[PDB]
Amino acid sequence: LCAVCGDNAACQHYGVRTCEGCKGFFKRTVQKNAKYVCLANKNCPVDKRRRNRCQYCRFQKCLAVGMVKEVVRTDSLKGRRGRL
Amino acid sequence: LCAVCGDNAACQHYGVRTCEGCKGFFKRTVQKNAKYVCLANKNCPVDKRRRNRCQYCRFQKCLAVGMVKEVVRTDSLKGRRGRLP
DNA sequence: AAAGGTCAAACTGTGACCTAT
DNA sequence: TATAGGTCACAGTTTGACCTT
Ligand SMILES: [Zn+2]
Ligand SMILES: [Zn+2]
Ligand SMILES: [Zn+2]
Ligand SMILES: [Zn+2]
């Protein structure tokens, strides 16, 4: 189970138990430094089924749970896979 | 000649001579009340070729050039096409 | 002259599965 | 084994040129 939307989560990703959807979403967001805007009141419901209706709230729950921006690899460590 | 992207513009749209690209962009943005974020410093060049590279800057030139949000039809007048008496 | 409608084409994002260590 | 990035069909979104008005 993932800490952001409650889907199946095999292991931790960037510091938090997360599924492979929010894993990639958080990764892509950090990779592109993308910014989102909530069209509601910053409380859109983030479960397995409505996670993708507001990327701001999905990313605002990624940070609330405890996802780490820095664990996503940049600078020297870009395109470097596996452990270190 | 469109005031927002310098493309061909046959007539005015929501107050300003604009192309049908920036027309549809302006209409859709206001209709959906969508909001954008410039990934840069709100300085992206909006030409015919780069207009689609930053939607936030493209909408801030729509407003700077003087297109008016209110001309887009909502409430009573939505789905209403053509001119008005 | 200018409003909304249309929608094929282009464009973009998601995520199950993979490999890398 | 845990967890990093890679892949990329598949899905979802955006665009304007054109059309009806
Ligand atoms: Zn998740
Ligand atoms: Zn939201
Ligand atoms: Zn234009
Ligand atoms: Zn910009």
Side-chain angles (χ1 to χ4, degrees), chain A residues 1-79 81-84, chain B residues 1-79 81-85:
Chain A
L1 253 66
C2 165
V4 162
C5 70
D7 194 353
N8 285 323
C11 74
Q12 290 201 140
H13 293 284
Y14 319 104
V16 185
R17 197 162 284 197
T18 53
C19 76
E20 290 255 6
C22 300
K23 171 193 147 189
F25 169 76
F26 187 84
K27 175 186 58 175
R28 273 180 325 256
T29 303
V30 184
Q31 285 180 350
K32 318 180 146 322
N33 209 1
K35 317 297 282 186
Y36 313 113
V37 185
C38 178
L39 294 192
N41 323 91
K42 309 196 166 156
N43 209 284
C44 311
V46 186
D47 50 39
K48 172 175 182 203
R49 132 163 186 265
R50 282 119 66 171
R51 53 179 172 197
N52 276 329
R53 272 169 201 190
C54 184
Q55 323 172 269
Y56 175 95
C57 280
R58 198 207 188 156
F59 196 68
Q60 171 189 239
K61 177 69 137 12
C62 280
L63 302 199
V65 268
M67 284 201 104
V68 171
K69 269 183 268 213
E70 297 69 5
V71 174
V72 189
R73 307 223 166 118
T74 60
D75 297 332
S76 315
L77 300 159
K78 184 176 193 187
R81 307 192 257 165
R83 208 192 172 163
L84 294 199
Chain B
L1 225 110
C2 185
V4 164
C5 69
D7 194 355
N8 285 322
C11 74
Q12 293 200 339
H13 295 284
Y14 318 103
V16 187
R17 181 164 284 280
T18 52
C19 73
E20 291 231 9
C22 298
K23 168 191 147 186
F25 169 77
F26 185 84
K27 176 229 303 183
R28 274 180 325 256
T29 302
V30 183
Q31 284 183 350
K32 324 188 86 49
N33 209 1
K35 317 221 147 234
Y36 315 111
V37 185
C38 179
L39 287 194
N41 317 253
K42 315 193 140 136
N43 54 10
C44 310
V46 182
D47 65 9
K48 174 173 183 202
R49 163 140 165 276
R50 309 168 175 66
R51 56 179 174 200
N52 284 343
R53 279 180 205 185
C54 184
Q55 321 173 269
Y56 176 90
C57 279
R58 200 212 189 152
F59 196 68
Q60 256 200 318
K61 170 126 110 178
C62 280
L63 302 195
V65 152
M67 313 176 62
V68 279
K69 272 182 141 277
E70 300 70 6
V71 172
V72 194
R73 309 222 168 118
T74 169
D75 295 332
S76 164
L77 306 88
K78 193 165 203 122
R81 316 190 259 168
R83 219 176 149 199
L84 295 198

